[PDB]
Enzyme design. Sequence first.
Site, PDB file in Angstrom:
ATOM      1  N   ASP A   1       7.555  16.199   9.074  1.00 14.21           N
ATOM      2  CA  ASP A   1       7.479  15.559   7.763  1.00 14.21           C
ATOM      3  C   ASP A   1       6.006  15.255   7.398  1.00 14.21           C
ATOM      4  OD1 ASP A   1       8.506  14.278   5.429  1.00 14.21           O
ATOM      5  OD2 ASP A   1       8.480  12.325   6.422  1.00 14.21           O
TER       6      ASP A   1
ATOM      7  N   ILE B   1       0.805  -1.235   0.000  1.00 17.14           N
ATOM      8  CA  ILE B   1       0.000   0.000   0.000  1.00 17.14           C
ATOM      9  C   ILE B   1       0.829   1.270   0.000  1.00 17.14           C
ATOM     10  CG2 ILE B   1      -2.147  -1.066   0.881  1.00 17.14           C
ATOM     11  CD1 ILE B   1      -1.249   0.168   3.783  1.00 17.14           C
TER      12      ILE B   1
ATOM     13  N   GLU C   1       5.198   3.181   0.109  1.00 22.84           N
ATOM     14  CA  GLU C   1       6.646   3.044   0.115  1.00 22.84           C
ATOM     15  C   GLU C   1       7.294   4.384   0.376  1.00 22.84           C
ATOM     16  OE1 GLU C   1       7.350   1.936  -4.147  1.00 22.84           O
ATOM     17  OE2 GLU C   1       7.996   4.061  -4.441  1.00 22.84           O
TER      18      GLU C   1
END
Length: 328
Positions: free
Chosen positions: A179, A20, A22
């Site tokens: 992030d 799902i 990466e």
Amino acid sequence: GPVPFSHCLPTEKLQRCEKIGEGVFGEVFQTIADHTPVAIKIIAIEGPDLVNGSHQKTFEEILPEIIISKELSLLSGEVCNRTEGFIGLNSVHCVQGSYPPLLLKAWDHYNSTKGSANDRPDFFKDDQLFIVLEFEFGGIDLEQMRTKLSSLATAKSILHQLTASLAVAEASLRFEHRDLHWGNVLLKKTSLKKLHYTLNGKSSTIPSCGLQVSIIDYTLSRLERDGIVVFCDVSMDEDLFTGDGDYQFDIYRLMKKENNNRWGEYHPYSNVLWLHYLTDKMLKQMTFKTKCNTPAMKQIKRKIQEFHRTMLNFSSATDLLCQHSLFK
Ligand SMILES: Nc1ncnc2c1c(I)cn2[C@@H]1O[C@H](CO)[C@@H](O)[C@H]1O
């Protein structure tokens, strides 16, 4: 020490894996554990091979993500500073082996359908170590949902939820995400009309618009408990700060400017920068089922634009949550 892959991923569990997502870090698979959906993030550690353009982290370098994921998972059961807005972490394991063929098959299917920016993970030897983090399945990331939201009211709920979650983590842990790009915001359908959180003992609610938002991915995050800081030291990472083609990559340079390349320090303003990045995505890169065309609706949009142009004058997610007119 480490367990084989089959301890964590016995056959039926491997057969149900679908890739799902990466990143440079490695790979994310969805599967089922005891009839419950989970997301497994698999990170190669301690080896000499380059993986997706980088050398592998050591145990000590991966530890901050592990610590923060655990600490943030706890907030759903706390009291004074409570929120369900961060992903639940079920377990962490250290696994040793070559990559399971079944994971490689799932990896190939994803490459054939969505394309991958990663190296096919077929070069690992039978002594390779990985960290395997098993999280609650949090839904679909905002990026993949960019054409799927009902309207700008939904966007408002999403921004409110994220701001509340970050505020609760600021209050409890002096947390900065660092992030929070739109791949790191997950949405899942919920039947609850109102979501709850508690900030310094005061409980409030937020209308869900049918979605529960979960924040993921603490690879760059920072927090502290009793004056002990846990963080990612990116002071020598030169590449993080030379990206282009998206406002995302400005945020890293801005963070570095504002903390003087001192990543241990607490600068909760960085949560505002990411929220501003996210608000931009919402105004520019999303298509909505219901449009820019009733009075009640156009007002919500005017409010999101006013939030966009004024939020950068607030000092933290807590400051936005508590003082910005969007949330009054
Ligand atoms: N717990 C989860 N539930 C659902 N999806 C998840 C996760 C986690 I951890 C990661 N992802 C998906 O994988 C992509 C890369 O991290 C993310 O952008 C996202 O697409």
